[PDB]
Coordinates of C-alpha atoms in Angstrom, one line a residue:
Chain A
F28 CA -24.4 -15.0 19.0
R29 CA -23.6 -15.4 22.5
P30 CA -19.7 -13.6 23.4
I31 CA -17.3 -16.1 24.3
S32 CA -13.8 -15.2 23.9
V33 CA -11.9 -11.9 23.2
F34 CA -8.4 -11.3 22.5
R35 CA -5.5 -8.4 20.9
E36 CA -2.8 -9.2 19.3
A37 CA 0.0 -10.1 21.6
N38 CA 3.3 -7.8 21.6
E39 CA 1.9 -5.1 19.8
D40 CA 1.3 -2.0 20.6
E41 CA -1.7 -0.9 18.2
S42 CA -3.2 -4.6 17.6
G43 CA -3.1 -5.9 14.0
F44 CA -5.2 -8.2 13.1
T45 CA -6.9 -8.3 9.5
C46 CA -8.5 -11.4 8.7
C47 CA -8.5 -14.7 9.8
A48 CA -9.9 -18.7 9.5
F49 CA -10.1 -21.7 11.7
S50 CA -7.4 -24.3 11.3
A51 CA -8.0 -27.8 11.2
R52 CA -6.3 -27.8 14.7
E53 CA -9.7 -26.4 16.8
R54 CA -9.5 -24.4 19.3
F55 CA -6.8 -22.1 17.3
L56 CA -7.5 -20.0 14.5
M57 CA -5.0 -18.9 12.1
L58 CA -4.9 -14.8 11.6
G59 CA -3.3 -12.5 8.9
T60 CA -2.0 -9.0 10.3
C61 CA -1.1 -5.7 8.6
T62 CA 2.4 -6.2 9.1
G63 CA 2.0 -9.7 6.4
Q64 CA 2.5 -12.0 9.5
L65 CA 0.6 -15.2 9.9
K66 CA -0.3 -15.8 13.7
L67 CA -1.7 -19.1 15.2
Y68 CA -4.0 -18.1 18.3
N69 CA -5.9 -20.2 21.1
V70 CA -9.3 -18.5 20.4
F71 CA -10.3 -19.5 23.8
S72 CA -7.4 -18.3 25.4
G73 CA -6.3 -15.8 23.6
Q74 CA -2.2 -17.0 23.5
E75 CA -0.2 -16.3 20.7
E76 CA 0.9 -19.9 19.5
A77 CA 3.2 -19.2 16.4
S78 CA 3.9 -16.6 13.7
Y79 CA 4.8 -16.6 10.5
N80 CA 6.3 -14.0 8.1
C81 CA 4.5 -14.4 4.6
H82 CA 4.2 -10.7 2.8
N83 CA 6.1 -7.8 2.7
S84 CA 2.3 -5.8 3.1
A85 CA -0.5 -6.3 4.7
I86 CA -2.5 -9.7 4.7
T87 CA -5.6 -9.3 3.1
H88 CA -7.5 -12.4 3.1
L89 CA -6.5 -16.0 3.8
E90 CA -8.1 -19.6 3.4
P91 CA -7.1 -22.8 4.5
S92 CA -7.7 -26.0 2.5
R93 CA -10.5 -28.2 4.2
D94 CA -7.8 -31.0 4.7
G95 CA -5.5 -28.3 7.1
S96 CA -2.6 -29.1 4.7
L97 CA -2.4 -26.1 2.8
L98 CA -3.1 -22.2 3.1
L99 CA -3.7 -19.3 0.8
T100 CA -2.4 -15.6 1.5
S101 CA -3.1 -12.5 -0.5
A102 CA -1.4 -9.4 0.4
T103 CA -1.6 -5.5 -0.3
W104 CA 0.5 -4.2 -2.7
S105 CA 3.9 -6.3 -2.6
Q106 CA 4.6 -8.9 -4.8
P107 CA 4.0 -12.0 -4.5
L108 CA 0.6 -10.6 -3.9
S109 CA -0.7 -14.4 -3.3
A110 CA 1.1 -17.2 -2.3
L111 CA 0.5 -20.9 -1.2
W112 CA 1.9 -22.2 1.9
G113 CA 2.5 -26.1 3.2
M114 CA 1.3 -26.8 6.8
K115 CA 2.2 -30.3 7.2
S116 CA 5.2 -30.4 10.3
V117 CA 6.7 -27.2 8.8
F118 CA 5.6 -24.0 7.4
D119 CA 6.8 -22.3 3.8
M120 CA 6.0 -21.5 0.5
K121 CA 4.9 -24.1 -2.1
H122 CA 4.4 -21.7 -4.8
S123 CA 3.4 -17.6 -5.6
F124 CA 1.3 -16.0 -7.6
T125 CA 2.9 -12.6 -8.2
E126 CA 0.0 -10.6 -9.5
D127 CA -3.2 -12.4 -8.2
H128 CA -4.5 -9.6 -5.5
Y129 CA -7.3 -12.4 -4.6
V130 CA -7.2 -16.5 -4.5
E131 CA -9.4 -19.2 -3.7
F132 CA -9.1 -23.1 -4.0
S133 CA -11.5 -24.9 -5.7
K134 CA -14.0 -26.2 -4.3
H135 CA -14.8 -30.1 -4.9
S136 CA -11.5 -31.7 -5.0
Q137 CA -9.2 -28.7 -3.9
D138 CA -6.3 -29.6 -6.7
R139 CA -6.8 -26.2 -8.2
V140 CA -6.3 -23.0 -7.4
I141 CA -8.3 -19.6 -8.9
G142 CA -6.6 -15.9 -8.5
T143 CA -7.8 -12.8 -9.5
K144 CA -5.8 -10.2 -11.4
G145 CA -8.2 -7.4 -12.4
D146 CA -10.8 -8.0 -15.0
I147 CA -8.6 -11.5 -15.0
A148 CA -9.2 -14.9 -13.9
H149 CA -6.0 -17.2 -13.8
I150 CA -6.4 -20.9 -12.7
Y151 CA -3.3 -22.6 -11.4
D152 CA -2.5 -26.2 -10.4
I153 CA -1.8 -27.0 -6.7
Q154 CA 1.1 -29.4 -7.4
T155 CA 3.2 -28.1 -10.4
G156 CA 1.7 -24.1 -9.7
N157 CA 1.5 -23.5 -13.5
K158 CA -0.9 -21.6 -15.1
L159 CA -3.4 -24.1 -16.4
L160 CA -5.6 -21.1 -17.8
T161 CA -6.7 -17.9 -18.5
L162 CA -10.5 -16.7 -18.3
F163 CA -10.7 -13.3 -20.4
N164 CA -12.8 -11.9 -22.8
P165 CA -13.0 -8.0 -22.9
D166 CA -16.0 -7.6 -25.0
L167 CA -17.8 -9.5 -22.3
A168 CA -15.8 -8.0 -19.4
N169 CA -17.9 -5.8 -16.6
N170 CA -15.0 -4.0 -15.4
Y171 CA -16.1 -5.1 -11.6
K172 CA -14.0 -2.4 -9.5
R173 CA -13.6 -5.4 -6.7
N174 CA -14.1 -8.3 -9.2
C175 CA -13.3 -11.6 -7.2
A176 CA -13.3 -14.9 -9.9
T177 CA -14.5 -18.0 -8.2
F178 CA -15.1 -21.5 -8.7
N179 CA -18.7 -23.3 -8.6
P180 CA -19.4 -26.2 -6.3
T181 CA -18.4 -28.7 -8.7
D182 CA -15.6 -26.5 -10.4
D183 CA -17.3 -27.5 -13.6
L184 CA -17.8 -23.4 -13.8
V185 CA -16.5 -20.2 -13.1
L186 CA -18.0 -16.9 -12.3
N187 CA -15.6 -14.3 -13.4
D188 CA -16.4 -10.4 -13.6
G189 CA -19.8 -11.1 -14.2
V190 CA -19.3 -13.8 -17.3
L191 CA -20.2 -17.2 -16.0
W192 CA -17.5 -19.6 -18.2
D193 CA -17.6 -23.3 -18.8
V194 CA -14.0 -24.7 -17.6
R195 CA -13.4 -27.8 -19.9
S196 CA -13.9 -26.0 -22.5
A197 CA -12.6 -22.2 -21.3
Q198 CA -15.5 -20.6 -22.9
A199 CA -17.5 -18.0 -21.6
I200 CA -21.5 -19.3 -21.8
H201 CA -23.6 -16.1 -20.3
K202 CA -22.7 -12.9 -19.5
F203 CA -24.9 -11.2 -16.4
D204 CA -25.7 -7.3 -17.2
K205 CA -23.8 -5.2 -14.9
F206 CA -26.0 -3.0 -12.2
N207 CA -23.2 -2.2 -9.7
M208 CA -19.6 -0.9 -9.9
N209 CA -18.2 -3.2 -7.4
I210 CA -19.3 -6.8 -6.5
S211 CA -18.9 -9.7 -9.2
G212 CA -20.8 -11.9 -7.6
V213 CA -20.3 -15.9 -6.3
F214 CA -22.0 -18.9 -6.7
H215 CA -25.0 -20.3 -4.2
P216 CA -23.9 -23.5 -2.5
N217 CA -26.6 -25.2 -4.2
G218 CA -24.9 -24.9 -7.8
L219 CA -27.8 -23.6 -9.4
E220 CA -28.2 -20.1 -8.5
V221 CA -25.5 -16.9 -8.3
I222 CA -26.1 -14.2 -6.2
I223 CA -24.4 -11.0 -8.0
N224 CA -24.9 -8.1 -5.4
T225 CA -28.7 -7.2 -5.0
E226 CA -29.6 -10.1 -7.7
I227 CA -30.3 -13.8 -7.5
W228 CA -30.0 -15.3 -10.9
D229 CA -31.3 -18.9 -11.5
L230 CA -28.7 -20.8 -13.5
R231 CA -31.6 -23.1 -15.1
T232 CA -32.8 -20.4 -16.9
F233 CA -31.2 -17.2 -16.4
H234 CA -34.4 -15.4 -14.8
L235 CA -34.1 -13.0 -12.0
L236 CA -35.3 -15.1 -9.1
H237 CA -35.1 -12.6 -6.0
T238 CA -34.0 -8.6 -5.6
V239 CA -32.3 -8.6 -2.2
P240 CA -31.5 -5.0 -1.7
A241 CA -29.5 -5.7 1.6
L242 CA -27.4 -7.4 0.0
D243 CA -25.4 -4.7 -1.7
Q244 CA -21.8 -4.1 -1.8
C245 CA -21.9 -7.3 0.7
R246 CA -19.9 -10.4 0.7
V247 CA -21.4 -13.5 1.7
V248 CA -20.3 -16.6 3.5
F249 CA -22.5 -19.7 4.5
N250 CA -23.1 -22.1 7.1
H251 CA -21.3 -25.4 6.2
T252 CA -24.9 -27.1 6.1
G253 CA -25.8 -24.0 3.3
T254 CA -28.9 -23.2 5.0
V255 CA -27.9 -19.5 6.1
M256 CA -25.8 -17.0 4.5
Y257 CA -23.9 -14.2 6.5
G258 CA -23.1 -10.8 4.8
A259 CA -21.6 -7.9 5.4
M260 CA -21.2 -4.3 3.4
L261 CA -18.2 -2.9 2.0
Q262 CA -17.5 0.8 3.5
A263 CA -17.1 2.6 -0.3
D264 CA -16.8 5.9 -1.0
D265 CA -15.8 5.3 -4.4
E266 CA -14.5 9.0 -4.3
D267 CA -12.0 7.9 -1.9
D268 CA -8.7 8.6 -2.4
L269 CA -5.7 6.4 -1.8
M270 CA -4.8 8.0 1.4
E271 CA -8.9 7.8 2.2
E272 CA -9.4 4.4 1.4
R273 CA -6.9 3.6 4.5
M274 CA -8.6 5.3 6.5
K275 CA -11.5 2.5 6.3
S276 CA -11.9 -0.8 7.6
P277 CA -13.2 -3.4 4.6
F278 CA -16.6 -3.8 6.0
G279 CA -19.2 -1.5 7.9
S280 CA -20.2 -2.8 11.5
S281 CA -22.9 -4.9 11.2
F282 CA -23.7 -8.0 9.7
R283 CA -26.7 -10.0 8.7
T284 CA -28.0 -13.6 8.9
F285 CA -30.6 -14.6 5.9
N286 CA -31.9 -18.0 5.3
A287 CA -30.1 -18.9 2.5
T288 CA -33.0 -21.1 0.7
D289 CA -35.2 -17.8 0.5
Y290 CA -33.3 -14.9 1.2
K291 CA -35.2 -13.9 4.3
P292 CA -34.0 -12.0 6.8
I293 CA -33.2 -14.0 10.0
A294 CA -30.9 -11.6 12.5
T295 CA -28.9 -8.1 12.3
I296 CA -26.1 -8.1 14.5
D297 CA -24.1 -4.9 15.2
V298 CA -21.3 -4.9 16.9
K299 CA -20.8 -1.6 17.3
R300 CA -17.1 -1.6 15.3
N301 CA -16.6 -2.0 12.1
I302 CA -15.5 -5.6 10.8
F303 CA -12.2 -6.5 9.1
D304 CA -13.1 -10.5 8.7
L305 CA -15.4 -13.3 10.1
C306 CA -15.5 -16.9 10.0
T307 CA -16.9 -20.4 11.1
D308 CA -15.8 -23.3 12.2
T309 CA -16.6 -26.7 10.3
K310 CA -19.3 -27.3 12.6
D311 CA -20.6 -24.2 12.5
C312 CA -20.7 -23.7 16.3
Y313 CA -18.4 -20.5 16.4
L314 CA -18.1 -17.2 14.9
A315 CA -14.7 -15.2 14.5
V316 CA -15.2 -11.6 13.7
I317 CA -12.2 -9.0 13.6
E318 CA -13.7 -6.1 15.2
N319 CA -11.7 -2.5 15.1
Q320 CA -12.0 -0.9 18.5
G321 CA -10.1 2.1 17.1
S322 CA -11.8 5.7 17.7
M323 CA -11.1 7.1 14.3
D324 CA -11.8 3.4 12.3
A325 CA -8.6 2.1 10.6
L326 CA -6.7 5.5 10.7
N327 CA -5.3 4.4 14.3
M328 CA -6.2 0.6 13.7
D329 CA -6.6 -1.7 16.7
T330 CA -8.3 -4.8 16.3
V331 CA -9.7 -7.7 18.3
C332 CA -10.5 -11.3 17.4
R333 CA -14.1 -11.8 19.1
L334 CA -15.4 -15.4 19.2
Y335 CA -19.3 -15.8 19.4
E336 CA -21.1 -18.9 20.0
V337 CA -23.8 -19.2 17.0
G338 CA -26.7 -20.4 18.3
Chain B
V26 CA 28.8 22.9 18.8
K27 CA 24.9 22.2 18.6
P28 CA 22.6 23.9 16.6
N29 CA 19.8 25.9 18.4
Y30 CA 16.8 25.3 15.6
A31 CA 13.9 27.4 16.9
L32 CA 10.0 27.4 15.4
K33 CA 9.6 30.8 13.6
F34 CA 6.2 29.9 11.2
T35 CA 4.1 27.2 10.6
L36 CA 2.1 27.2 7.6
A37 CA -1.0 26.0 7.1
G38 CA -3.2 25.4 3.7
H39 CA -2.6 22.5 2.3
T40 CA -6.1 19.8 3.3
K41 CA -4.2 16.5 3.0
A42 CA -0.9 15.0 4.0
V43 CA 2.2 17.2 2.8
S44 CA 4.5 15.3 0.6
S45 CA 7.9 17.1 0.0
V46 CA 9.4 20.7 0.8
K47 CA 12.0 22.3 -1.4
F48 CA 13.9 25.7 -0.8
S49 CA 14.7 27.1 -4.0
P50 CA 18.0 27.2 -5.3
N51 CA 17.9 31.2 -5.2
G52 CA 16.9 31.1 -1.5
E53 CA 13.6 33.2 -1.6
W54 CA 10.8 30.3 -2.3
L55 CA 9.7 27.2 -0.4
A56 CA 7.5 25.1 -2.8
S57 CA 5.4 22.0 -1.0
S58 CA 3.4 19.4 -2.8
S59 CA 0.5 17.5 -1.2
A60 CA -1.9 14.6 -1.3
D61 CA -4.4 17.3 -2.1
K62 CA -3.2 17.2 -5.7
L63 CA -1.7 20.8 -5.0
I64 CA 1.7 22.5 -4.9
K65 CA 2.1 25.9 -2.9
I66 CA 4.7 28.8 -3.1
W67 CA 5.6 30.5 0.4
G68 CA 8.0 32.8 1.3
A69 CA 11.3 30.8 2.5
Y70 CA 11.9 34.3 5.2
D71 CA 8.4 35.1 6.1
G72 CA 6.5 31.9 5.6
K73 CA 3.6 33.9 3.8
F74 CA 1.8 31.9 1.1
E75 CA 2.5 33.0 -2.1
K76 CA 0.6 31.2 -4.9
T77 CA -1.1 27.8 -5.7
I78 CA 0.0 25.7 -8.6
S79 CA -2.8 22.9 -9.6
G80 CA -3.3 20.8 -12.3
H81 CA -2.5 16.8 -11.5
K82 CA -5.2 14.3 -11.1
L83 CA -4.3 12.7 -8.3
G84 CA -1.7 13.0 -4.5
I85 CA 1.2 14.6 -5.6
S86 CA 4.2 12.2 -3.9
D87 CA 7.3 14.9 -4.8
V88 CA 8.4 18.5 -6.1
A89 CA 11.9 19.6 -7.4
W90 CA 13.4 22.9 -8.7
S91 CA 15.4 23.8 -11.6
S92 CA 18.8 24.9 -10.7
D93 CA 17.9 28.5 -11.9
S94 CA 14.8 28.7 -9.5
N95 CA 12.0 29.3 -12.5
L96 CA 10.9 25.7 -13.1
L97 CA 9.6 23.2 -11.1
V98 CA 8.8 19.7 -11.6
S99 CA 6.1 17.2 -9.8
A100 CA 5.8 13.6 -9.8
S101 CA 2.2 11.9 -9.0
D102 CA 0.1 9.2 -8.4
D103 CA -1.6 9.9 -11.4
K104 CA 1.3 8.3 -13.0
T105 CA 2.9 11.4 -14.9
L106 CA 5.2 14.4 -13.9
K107 CA 4.7 17.5 -14.7
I108 CA 7.0 20.7 -15.9
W109 CA 5.7 24.0 -14.3
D110 CA 6.7 27.5 -15.1
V111 CA 6.6 28.8 -11.4
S112 CA 5.9 32.8 -12.4
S113 CA 2.9 32.0 -14.6
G114 CA 1.6 28.8 -12.9
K115 CA 1.3 27.3 -16.2
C116 CA 2.0 23.7 -16.7
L117 CA 4.6 23.6 -19.5
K118 CA 4.8 19.4 -20.0
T119 CA 3.1 16.5 -18.6
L120 CA 5.9 13.4 -19.1
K121 CA 4.1 10.2 -19.9
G122 CA 5.2 7.0 -19.7
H123 CA 5.1 5.6 -16.1
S124 CA 2.5 2.8 -15.5
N125 CA 2.2 3.5 -12.3
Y126 CA 2.2 6.5 -9.4
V127 CA 5.5 8.7 -9.6
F128 CA 7.3 8.9 -6.1
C129 CA 10.2 10.6 -6.9
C130 CA 11.6 13.3 -9.5
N131 CA 15.1 15.7 -9.7
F132 CA 16.3 17.9 -12.5
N133 CA 20.0 17.6 -13.2
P134 CA 22.1 20.4 -12.6
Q135 CA 21.9 21.6 -16.4
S136 CA 18.7 21.5 -16.0
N137 CA 17.8 19.9 -19.5
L138 CA 17.3 16.5 -17.9
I139 CA 14.3 14.8 -15.4
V140 CA 15.0 11.5 -14.0
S141 CA 12.4 9.9 -11.9
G142 CA 11.2 7.0 -10.2
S143 CA 8.1 4.7 -9.9
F144 CA 6.0 2.2 -8.3
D145 CA 6.7 0.1 -11.4
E146 CA 10.1 -0.4 -10.4
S147 CA 11.7 1.6 -13.2
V148 CA 13.8 4.5 -13.3
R149 CA 12.9 7.2 -16.4
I150 CA 15.1 10.3 -17.8
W151 CA 13.4 12.7 -19.4
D152 CA 14.0 15.6 -22.0
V153 CA 13.1 18.8 -20.1
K154 CA 12.6 20.8 -23.4
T155 CA 10.4 17.9 -25.7
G156 CA 8.9 16.6 -22.6
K157 CA 9.8 13.1 -24.0
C158 CA 11.1 9.8 -22.4
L159 CA 14.7 9.8 -23.1
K160 CA 15.5 6.5 -21.6
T161 CA 13.8 3.6 -19.3
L162 CA 15.8 1.8 -16.9
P163 CA 15.3 -1.4 -15.6
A164 CA 16.4 -0.2 -12.2
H165 CA 15.0 -2.2 -9.5
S166 CA 12.9 -5.6 -8.7
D167 CA 10.8 -3.6 -6.4
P168 CA 9.0 0.3 -6.0
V169 CA 11.4 2.9 -6.8
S170 CA 11.8 5.5 -3.3
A171 CA 14.3 8.3 -4.5
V172 CA 16.4 9.3 -7.6
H173 CA 19.0 12.1 -7.4
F174 CA 21.5 13.4 -9.7
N175 CA 25.3 14.3 -8.7
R176 CA 27.1 17.5 -8.6
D177 CA 28.0 17.5 -12.0
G178 CA 25.3 15.8 -13.4
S179 CA 27.3 12.7 -15.1
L180 CA 25.7 9.7 -12.1
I181 CA 22.2 9.1 -10.9
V182 CA 21.4 7.4 -7.6
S183 CA 18.4 5.3 -6.8
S184 CA 16.8 3.7 -4.0
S185 CA 14.3 0.7 -3.6
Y186 CA 12.1 -1.3 -1.8
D187 CA 14.4 -4.3 -3.0
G188 CA 16.7 -2.8 -0.5
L189 CA 19.5 -1.8 -2.9
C190 CA 20.7 1.5 -3.8
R191 CA 22.1 1.9 -7.4
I192 CA 24.2 4.6 -9.6
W193 CA 23.8 5.4 -13.1
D194 CA 25.4 6.5 -16.0
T195 CA 23.8 9.6 -16.8
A196 CA 24.2 9.6 -20.4
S197 CA 24.6 5.7 -21.2
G198 CA 22.1 4.3 -18.4
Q199 CA 24.2 1.9 -17.6
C200 CA 23.9 0.3 -14.1
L201 CA 27.8 1.6 -12.5
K202 CA 27.2 0.2 -8.6
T203 CA 24.9 -1.8 -6.5
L204 CA 25.3 -0.8 -2.9
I205 CA 24.2 -3.7 -0.2
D206 CA 25.6 -3.7 3.5
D207 CA 25.1 -6.7 5.8
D208 CA 21.5 -6.9 5.1
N209 CA 18.7 -5.5 2.8
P210 CA 15.7 -4.3 4.0
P211 CA 13.7 -1.4 2.0
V212 CA 15.6 1.6 0.9
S213 CA 13.3 4.1 1.5
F214 CA 15.3 7.3 0.8
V215 CA 18.9 8.3 -0.8
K216 CA 20.8 11.5 -2.3
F217 CA 24.0 12.4 -3.2
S218 CA 26.2 14.3 -0.8
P219 CA 26.9 18.2 -1.9
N220 CA 30.5 17.2 -2.8
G221 CA 29.2 14.0 -4.9
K222 CA 31.8 11.8 -3.1
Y223 CA 29.2 10.1 -0.6
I224 CA 25.3 8.5 -0.4
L225 CA 22.9 9.2 2.0
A226 CA 20.5 6.4 2.5
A227 CA 17.7 6.0 4.7
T228 CA 16.6 2.0 5.5
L229 CA 13.6 0.8 7.3
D230 CA 15.2 -0.4 9.7
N231 CA 15.6 2.8 11.5
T232 CA 18.8 3.7 10.2
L233 CA 20.7 6.3 8.1
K234 CA 24.0 5.4 6.4
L235 CA 26.7 7.6 4.8
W236 CA 28.5 5.4 2.0
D237 CA 31.0 6.3 -0.4
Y238 CA 29.7 4.6 -2.9
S239 CA 33.0 4.5 -5.1
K240 CA 34.7 2.3 -2.4
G241 CA 31.2 0.7 -1.7
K242 CA 32.1 1.4 1.9
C243 CA 29.3 2.5 4.8
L244 CA 31.0 5.2 6.8
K245 CA 28.4 6.7 9.1
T246 CA 25.8 5.6 10.9
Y247 CA 23.3 7.4 12.3
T248 CA 20.5 6.2 14.7
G249 CA 18.0 7.0 17.6
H250 CA 14.6 8.0 15.2
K251 CA 11.8 6.3 14.1
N252 CA 11.5 4.9 10.6
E253 CA 10.1 1.5 9.6
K254 CA 7.2 2.7 7.3
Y255 CA 7.4 6.0 5.8
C256 CA 9.5 7.2 3.1
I257 CA 11.3 10.1 4.8
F258 CA 13.3 12.7 2.9
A259 CA 16.7 13.3 4.6
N260 CA 19.2 16.1 3.9
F261 CA 23.2 17.2 4.5
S262 CA 23.1 20.9 6.5
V263 CA 25.7 22.6 5.4
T264 CA 25.6 26.4 5.9
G265 CA 26.7 26.2 9.3
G266 CA 27.4 23.4 11.4
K267 CA 27.8 20.0 9.6
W268 CA 25.0 18.5 9.9
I269 CA 22.6 15.4 9.1
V270 CA 19.0 16.2 9.1
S271 CA 15.7 13.9 8.9
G272 CA 12.1 13.3 9.8
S273 CA 10.8 10.9 11.8
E274 CA 8.2 8.7 12.5
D275 CA 7.7 10.0 16.6
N276 CA 6.9 13.2 14.4
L277 CA 10.3 14.8 15.4
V278 CA 13.0 16.1 13.4
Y279 CA 16.0 14.9 14.0
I280 CA 20.0 16.6 13.7
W281 CA 23.2 14.6 13.9
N282 CA 26.7 15.6 13.8
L283 CA 27.8 14.3 10.9
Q284 CA 31.3 13.1 12.0
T285 CA 30.7 12.0 14.8
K286 CA 27.1 10.8 14.5
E287 CA 25.7 11.9 17.9
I288 CA 21.8 13.6 18.1
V289 CA 22.3 17.5 18.5
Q290 CA 19.0 18.3 18.3
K291 CA 14.9 17.2 18.3
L292 CA 12.6 19.6 16.8
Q293 CA 9.2 18.9 18.5
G294 CA 5.8 20.3 17.5
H295 CA 4.6 18.5 14.4
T296 CA 1.6 16.0 14.9
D297 CA 1.8 13.4 12.6
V298 CA 5.0 11.6 10.9
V299 CA 7.5 14.2 9.5
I300 CA 7.9 12.8 5.8
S301 CA 10.4 15.6 4.8
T302 CA 12.5 18.6 5.6
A303 CA 14.5 20.5 3.4
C304 CA 17.5 22.8 4.3
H305 CA 17.8 26.5 3.3
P306 CA 20.9 27.2 0.5
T307 CA 22.1 29.6 2.4
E308 CA 21.0 30.5 5.7
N309 CA 20.5 28.1 8.9
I310 CA 16.9 27.2 8.2
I311 CA 14.9 24.0 8.2
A312 CA 11.5 23.1 6.8
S313 CA 9.6 20.2 7.4
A314 CA 6.2 18.7 6.8
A315 CA 3.9 16.1 8.3
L316 CA 1.0 13.9 7.3
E317 CA -2.5 13.5 7.0
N318 CA -3.3 14.3 11.2
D319 CA -1.0 17.4 10.8
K320 CA -1.0 18.9 7.4
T321 CA 1.4 21.6 8.3
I322 CA 5.2 23.2 7.4
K323 CA 7.5 24.5 10.0
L324 CA 10.2 26.8 9.5
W325 CA 12.8 26.6 11.9
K326 CA 15.7 28.7 12.6
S327 CA 19.4 28.4 14.0
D328 CA 22.2 30.6 15.1
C329 CA 24.5 27.9 13.4

């Protein structure tokens, strides 16, 4: 990971980048900010290209569609908590999801959105914005504190709060036992296993395939071939109150890469600054990382975006 | 004529940001609430710690005195308010009903009702003696930042992140006025003037405005300070010169001439946002309180 470029938010006394994703027009990166703005930057020059007002509170997370026509944003406390934006010619809101604090596109045909409100998953149609489904069963819930509902690679299954759902039947098919307080788990890109905190479960059998202690409290993302996994550990203290939560960046100061087939470790990278987000481009040539240089972490938040060459 | 407030005492003791300071109506005490979940009582003239009042489960956003100085009400992030007997320090009632954090509270002049405002976008009116909710007002489409009774208790004013101030009939709960100007940035604070004729409102565009709410007219604008993020309390200073008083996100207390709208003083000393100020009821004394990187309360005294 050779450093290629660095830049901070233009105009602003304290740089407020909070999250990032490469846009379809490569060389340009989309970043959310702590003031609910979506901004476009040239990742090589550091030149701000555009700014759009998306939310009345800090952007927490975002996801562009693969075809570059749509964008999902999630905010912090203001409603709508998530929104869907059109990126063709003019930028504007197509739909809003007022109570979902997290949203993802469906994965195969990106024709739906899955939002999360606490323990509950919502599936929406991208065209109409209609809620197509609610997935929640209080007798199976694990009540994961940072639950995130997610589609599998073919969109026929959903993982929500540690419960595996069959979409077409809106039926829960399996409940994975609870072994941590926060992380609810993601699908592996191969479609045949799930990664729930430190537990790797086989969807063929529900046998435990791997214990990976390094993944505790981690979020993960895969390179586009599905051969490498990035993971970074959330900063936690559940005994933190509301004020103490804001004092922290989302992640610690290191991320790890793992072989995606057997979870063996590849690299451990410590950028010596706490991490807000990271992403790769579709070709996995570049890694973008939002790094806080603030002396007291997110207390005096002051983030830069670093572009690294993926070797 | 300008005041000459000068620093007399600094009150340390809270272990997290101080959210609200309030002089008792009899002038003897200062009450302070804190993110540390505690209410502390101090001597209003000597600044000496008197006692700690405890019972909330999470941070406290606001506290308020009953007219006779014997009770307090607090509003908490734990989604309740509590009514306290000041002498004993005991919790007389817990008011339960809000579905999220309670940010603002006040007794009415008669002291038989409490009004509360919440992140859940409602205003609620409570029976002081039963501890029960009398009315739930669907007051706003965004979090409520302040609630206040007028001088005869017949009206409530509320302010909200939806950009609106609203006036309510205490008895019926009917909305009687919606104040909005040329824009609607979040309204972060509001209260009635002591004569009941005006409304003083802060918006998160670094601006305070004095409204004739009956006429629906903005009469005075006060600027020069920094207020774009926090819900800073503000006051009419009426014991000497006629001022407007407010904290500021540059860590200063600002004082304006009410009529001319010019800044007449800025009080330096705090090391974080000055989120709360209070004007003593009979003497030219100001209390100020600051957030997490400061944690102290300051007492200032002026000759006019």
